[PDB]
Design a protein around this ligand. Structure first.
Ligand SMILES: CCC(=O)c1ccc(F)c([C@@H]2C[C@@H]2NC(=O)Nc2ccc(Br)cn2)c1O
Lengths: 399, 542
């Protein structure tokens, strides 16, 4: 078919990101895949006359044995933004988050059938490195739509529509959403019916060639800030209480602490339970239980996720656009990095179902540690933006 | 010759055009040299006479120096020639190894027919020429040359999987596990393969036959080491002298275990004259001494055996300094190294140990493509207690304990619950932003209340100074209540060393105590207790 012309955001040049070193097994994996992708003409060797580069990695399918190739196009996506976001954007259905069940299906292999504009191929160069830099390093570029690029779904959008048309027309209440490599399919059917409907959809996909991992959005609720229920209340326990309440005052308007804040003693000293205090305490937690009034999602602003390590396999997180004005909060529960990588994929996935975009992550870990190990447990086909933070003593707060 | 190999298409940067530099006048001496030289070159096809673009040509002692600064700036970018350099420790043992150096690398490779016009130059009195092969100082020669030399070699490599070839610039290192007899055979089969592609190579002038000197190393077929290190032994030392010494030592630290340069590096601190004499201190004297000791007897490294595991051991030596060895067979070290990076203003040995493990793990992936198993001077218990309570996610590859003092440990733990029957200290600190005058004090539940005045301090410092007070006039067990998240954060990270003089003091107190409990409450919120202290700490001076 006729290729669609692609342009970079004027003023921006192609990606020139260095290739992070890989372990032996991942390198062997990569040359086998690339060798096979070459015979099939999906990618072709290139020389030094190509100044661009994008890093590549090798992940395990869906916890199986087959090594899948993963390319980090975060840079190229950013330099192609208006093309795939505005020029050929894909609307995100508000209904999806409501659906009782959502199945995620990988339709990535479908992109290797459409060719890429010859004038854009150079920007997709990548390098398979070698152990101890003993051999120069194999370089390639794509000839067809690559997988981790957001331009791929935008272009292939035309075909996906014809392929899904029949199934759509026959099942008017099933929601289908596409997001860079995956198809989100939601229904309110009883699981059996749902699972059956997914199978039927795969059969359509089987033609064209181009239970599957299920989510339950409707059963997703916020993680409230908690206040002890106690029954003792030491001087310490109520100082911690007044502190946490002090926080929830710059957020969650209405949180009153005054009739409690006024309760040089020893920390050990226990103290009587106040009248209205009981009332206030109760009224405070009455809030903090329901969304911060006034906070709304701004489609033109970035979403960012912050994660705190609550120790003992417990991780809390918040999603917000402006600090402390939480759109959503939650929890997650043996390598710290393995759990963290797990939490990041869960949060991104929920984030895609709900807003249709990935959040930028503030990760409580050392850069070098994350970069050395995240691919080791990663299993999604997308890669979110991330920065490394030093968690303030805001872990006690829980949000 | 000129390789019959396809040429690499090359173009100029986006909105730029070929160079048009003016040819500055030369003397008769130079003009004659250039003519003799260019004629010689013209006969071999390296250059061709042309009848719009110009690049200045010089001549110096007689060689032709083309100044390509203009063209290079207008020439496109290429992908880097190498991501890194192989490390000896990562090399496999080899029976026979020979080095062949390509005759006229650049001049034996054609230049994209459509780019030659930009390489035009002239010889004054004018005679004009352009290049057909890769020019010397041009920006694309190293890339296109290596790239071309790689295509030329593929066919031969395929037919000789048993033959290993490493291209480094002009030279070619060919190694195999064959017999010097059958090896040299194969070498010739290679020279001939290269000759069929326009590349001439030595006949028996093969600089080949180790010991080989390369990149600062000396590789033998059975081992490798760094080239001879020799410490001067001067009566005086200039900044320049110390810098050279620190460089050699750091270079030797790749295989000579235990090299230390902290004392020597301390001297080079503070902007100072390159030729100025710096008197050595006792510590630097001892350090330089220890190093000389280590360097007296030659040490060699072993090559990598893909079939065995890597074992990395890390020893602690001095504060903030770590040394490590990586071997496969007990004590036959593949490589050596040292870690010392501070990283932050306050840290403890466990954090530092975790960082070193990180360096080694990354370094290992690059060199051997796999992470080694560690032997750390830390108890599974000390590690577990720290991993669990630290806020930062920490991981560490498969390791084992190894009792090689100094063992690593936490020097104090902070209670998670308030101590009972312990005196509670409500501390606070204020400071006037203009006069910098402050007051660090406290008030306890036993009625004690001290308030010292401070001069030239920040607001954070009075808060840190106030905690230092509560720790002095305090018993072995104490509950402290601060309103400083800053102080809390630092202390709650259990640091055992800092760049802050005050923080290091607070650490001494913390180690002496037997039970300490820190707590935080909001500032200026009149919180019962904090107000009392806040009252006298902010009374004036704020
Ligand atoms: C002397 C430098 C050198 O020979 C050399 C340097 C880097 C490099 F990657 C290689 C190729 C990998 C192959 N060599 C080896 O694996 N081992 C090896 C052992 C002893 C000697 Br001498 C040279 N090489 C090299 O052969």
């Amino acid at each position: 078919i006729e290729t669609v012309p692609v342009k970079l955001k004027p003023g921006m040049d192609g990606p020139k990101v260095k290739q992070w070193p890989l372990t032996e097994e991942k390198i062997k994996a990569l040359v086998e895949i690339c060798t096979e992708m070459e015979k099939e003409g999906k990618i072709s060797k290139i020389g030094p006359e190509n100044p661009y580069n994008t890093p590549v990695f090798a992940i395990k399918k869906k916890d199986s044995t087959k090594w899948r190739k993963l390319v980090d196009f975060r840079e190229l996506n950013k330099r192609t933004q208006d093309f795939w976001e505005v020029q050929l954007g894909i609307p995100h259905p508000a209904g999806l988050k409501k659906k009782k069940s959502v199945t995620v299906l990988d339709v990535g292999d479908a992109y290797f059938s459409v060719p890429l504009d010859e004038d854009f191929r150079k920007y997709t160069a990548f390098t398979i490195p070698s152990i101890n830099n003993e051999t120069p390093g194999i370089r390639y570029q794509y000839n067809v739509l690559p997988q981790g690029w957001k331009g791929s779904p935008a272009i292939f959008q035309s075909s996906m529509t014809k392929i899904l048309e029949p199934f759509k027309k026959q099942n008017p209440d099933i929601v289908i959403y596409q997001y860079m490599d995956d198809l989100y399919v939601g229904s309110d059917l009883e699981i059996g019916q749902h699972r059956t409907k997914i199978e039927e959809l795969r059969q359509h996909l089987l033609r064209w060639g181009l239970m599957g991992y299920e989510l339950h959005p409707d059963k997703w609720t916020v993680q409230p800030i908690v206040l002890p229920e106690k029954d003792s209340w030491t001087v310490n326990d109520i100082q911690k209480l007044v502190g946490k309440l002090n926080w929830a005052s710059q957020i969650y308007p209405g949180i009153k602490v005054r009739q409690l804040c006024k309760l040089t003693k020893a920390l050990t000293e226990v103290i009587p339970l106040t009248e209205e205090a009981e009332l206030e305490l109760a009224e405070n937690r009455e809030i903090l239980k329901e969304p911060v009034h006034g906070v709304y999602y701004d489609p033109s602003k970035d979403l960012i996720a912050e994660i705190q390590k609550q120790g003992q396999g417990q991780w809390t997180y918040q999603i917000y656009q402006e600090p402390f004005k939480n759109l959503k909060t939650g929890k997650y529960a043996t390598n710290d990095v393995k759990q963290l990588t797990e939490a990041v994929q869960k949060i991104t996935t929920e984030s895609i179902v709900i807003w249709g975009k990935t959040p930028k992550f503030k990760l409580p870990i050392q850069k070098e540690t994350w970069e050395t190990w995240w691919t080791e447990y990663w299993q999604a086909t997308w890669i979110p933006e991330w920065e490394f933070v030093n968690t303030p003593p805001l872990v006690k707060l829980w949000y | 010759p000129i390789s019959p190999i396809e040429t690499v298409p090359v173009k100029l940067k986006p909105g730029m055009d070929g160079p048009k530099v003016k040819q500055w006048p030369l003397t008769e001496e130079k003009i004659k040299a250039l003519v003799e030289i260019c004629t010689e070159m013209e006969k071999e096809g390296k250059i061709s006479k042309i009848g719009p673009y110009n690049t200045p040509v010089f001549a110096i002692k007689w060689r032709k120096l083309v100044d390509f600064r203009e063209l290079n700036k207008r020439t496109q970018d290429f992908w880097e020639v190498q991501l890194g350099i192989p490390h000896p420790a990562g090399l496999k043992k080899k029976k026979s190894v020979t080095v062949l150096d390509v005759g006229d690398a650049y001049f034996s490779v054609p230049l994209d027919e459509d780019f030659r016009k930009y390489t035009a130059f002239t010889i004054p009195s004018g005679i004009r020429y352009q290049y057909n092969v890769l020019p010397q100082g041009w920006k694309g020669s190293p890339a296109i040359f290596q790239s071309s030399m790689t295509k030329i070699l593929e066919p031969f490599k395929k037919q000789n999987p048993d033959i290993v070839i490493y291209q480094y610039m002009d030279d070619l290192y060919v190694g195999s596990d064959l017999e010097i007899g059958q090896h040299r055979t194969k070498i010739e089969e290679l020279r001939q393969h290269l000759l069929r592609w326009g590349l001439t190579t030595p006949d028996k002038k093969h600089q080949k036959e180790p010991p080989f000197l390369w990149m600062g190393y000396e590789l033998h077929p059975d081992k490798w080491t760094v080239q001879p290190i020799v410490l001067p032994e001067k009566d005086s030392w200039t900044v320049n002298d110390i810098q050279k010494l620190v460089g050699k030592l750091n270079w030797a630290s790749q295989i000579y275990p235990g090299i230390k340069v902290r004392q020597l590096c301390k001297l080079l601190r503070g902007t100072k004259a390159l030729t100025e004499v710096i008197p050595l201190t006792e510590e630097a004297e001892l350090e330089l001494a220890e190093n000389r000791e280590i360097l007296k007897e030659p040490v060699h490294g072993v090559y990598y055996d893909p079939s065995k595991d890597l074992i990395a051991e890390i020893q602690k030596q001095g504060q903030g300094q770590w040394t490590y060895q990586i071997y496969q067979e007990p004590f036959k070290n593949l490589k050596t190294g040292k870690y010392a990076r501070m990283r932050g203003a306050h840290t403890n040995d466990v954090k530092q140990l975790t960082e070193a493990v990180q360096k080694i793990t990354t370094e290992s992936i690059v060199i051997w493509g796999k992470t080694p198993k560690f032997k750390l001077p830390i108890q599974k218990e000390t590690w577990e207690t720290w991993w669990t309570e630290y806020w930062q996610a920490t991981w560490i590859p498969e390791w084992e304990f190894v009792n090689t003092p100094p063992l690593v440990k936490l020097w104090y733990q902070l209670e998670k619950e308030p101590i009972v029957g312990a005196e509670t200290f409500y501390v606070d600190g204020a400071a006037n932003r203009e006069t910098k005058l402050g007051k660090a004090g406290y008030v306890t539940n036993k009625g004690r209340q001290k308030v010292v005045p401070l001069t030239n301090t920040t607001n954070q410092k009075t808060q840190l100074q106030a905690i230092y007070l509560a720790l002095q006039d305090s018993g072995l067990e104490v509950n402290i209540v601060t309103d400083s998240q800053y102080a809390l954060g630092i202390i709650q990270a259990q640091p055992d060393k800092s760049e802050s003089e005050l923080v290091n003091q607070i650490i001494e107190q913390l180690i002496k105590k037997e039970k300490v409990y820190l707590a935080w409450v909001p500032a200026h919120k009149g919180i019962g207790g904090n107000e009392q202290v806040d009252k006298l700490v902010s009374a004036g001076i704020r």
